[PDB]
Amino acid sequence: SFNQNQLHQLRAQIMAYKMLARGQPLPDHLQMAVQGKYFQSGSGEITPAAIQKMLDDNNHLIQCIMDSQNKGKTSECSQYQQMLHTNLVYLATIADSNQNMQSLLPAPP
Amino acid sequence: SFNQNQLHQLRAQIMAYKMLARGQPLPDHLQMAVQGKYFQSGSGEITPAAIQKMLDDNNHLIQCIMDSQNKGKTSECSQYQQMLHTNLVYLATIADSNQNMQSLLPAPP
Amino acid sequence: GSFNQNQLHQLRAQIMAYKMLARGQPLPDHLQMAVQGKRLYFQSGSGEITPAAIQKMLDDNNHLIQCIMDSQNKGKTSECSQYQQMLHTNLVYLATIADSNQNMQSLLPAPP
Amino acid sequence: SFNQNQLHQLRAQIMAYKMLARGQPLPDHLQMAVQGKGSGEITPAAIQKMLDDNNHLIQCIMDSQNKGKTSECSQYQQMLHTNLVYLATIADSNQNMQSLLPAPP
């Protein structure tokens, strides 16, 4: 259960990840989208603030990847990228499971 | 990142998940281990307390999954299952990255 | 599986020792003993490695670490390289087996 | 250091591994080749024990394939692979010619 801003921020971080793994710099349009524009439930289900907390993490991870890159700091760059990647897999998984619409349909009548 | 109590609790929850997914009940020793015994970092790396928050989330998801198998509510016994599965993949991925030993070795001499 | 906690500790220490021995350093006395560890059934029916097989190769690695050190003092350059190559290949093997055994993502089935 | 029997059994086990990763069967000629006939370095008996282990894993993998046990098949495959990588690294190190040569004069 993402909100629109969160889905837009997530997809922006997934694109930022791909460019950073290809050494590329980030367009300022993308840099800002990466940054964007109660915390724990009773069941254990994730909450909107939990989602925003992880997306804010990702934004900071991205700042760290670029700083490590631009200083040639290599192994630290990869530990950040692997943390980012694991977060994005997690958020992408939750986003798809809740937004998916085929699985709401029964068999043909 | 992970301490040993947490690694142990994660493993028990993974094992609990597999039994619950194949409709079994949980042994007493596993029902105990899945319970065990701020939150944000400046760089975005997950923190011990974030890890423990999700492990507690998972224990409450496991309690709800066990109930909906005695409450007959088949449908939400699977949204809980899918939330627990995605959490376990995430924690397992972080735990495997930290504990990995082959990455600590250089290339051949 | 087959790794116990003492072996995982001995294997980390040997990996640490390996690098120090590759960057010319000597090993502190603490680490020289962490590499020995503390203190039959060597083959299994299926071929899976056994605890005793792991322990024998960790002990071999300790002897290799000792041959490496001694031959670094005596500058035996060509001795040192063959020992280092054997140690490296053992540590990669033990590290791969330890990782596979401890790996927790592979324990999880497909999404529901 | 390997002997020629071991090198031949190792190459056959490397071949057998690839075919099994493709669900294919093993010609009897390969199956038989896969079976064969203080300082810390590896010894020839240690080499043979691991080649013997690999034959036993291959039997377990084939049996786990035929009987459809997929999770078990891949755990043996992972163990056989790690053994093969290890024996191959050692055999390649001992036999490698180019690393013996200095830089151009």
Residue numbers in the entry:
A (entry chain C), B (entry chain B): 2 to 38, 50 to 121
C (entry chain A): 1 to 39, 49 to 121
D (entry chain D): 2 to 38, 54 to 121
Provide excerpts from the study:
We succeeded in obtaining crystals of the single polypeptide created by the fusion of BRG1(172–213) to the N-terminus of SS18(14–101) with a tobacco etch virus (TEV)-cleavable segment. The crystal structure of BRG1(172-213)-SS18(14-101) was determined at a resolution of 2.39 Å with four copies of the complex molecule in one asymmetric unit. The overall structure of BRG1(172-213)-SS18(14-101) resembles a four-helix bundle, which span residues 174–190 (αA), 198–205 (αB) in BRG1(172-213) and residues 19–39 (α1), 44–74 (α2) in SS18(14-101). Residues A65, L54, and I32 were mutated to glutamic acid in SS18 or SS18-SSX1, herein referred to as SS18(3M) and SS18(3M)-SSX1, respectively. As anticipated, co-immunoprecipitation (co-IP) analyses showed that the 3M mutations in SS18 or SS18-SSX1 can largely disrupt the binding of SS18 (lane 3 compared to lane 2 in Fig. 1f) or SS18-SSX1 (lane 4 compared to lane 2 in Supplementary Fig. 4a) to BRG1.
The ATP-dependent chromatin remodeling complex BAF, also known as mammalian SWI/SNF complex, is a multi-subunit remodeler and is crucial for regulating gene expression and developmental programming.
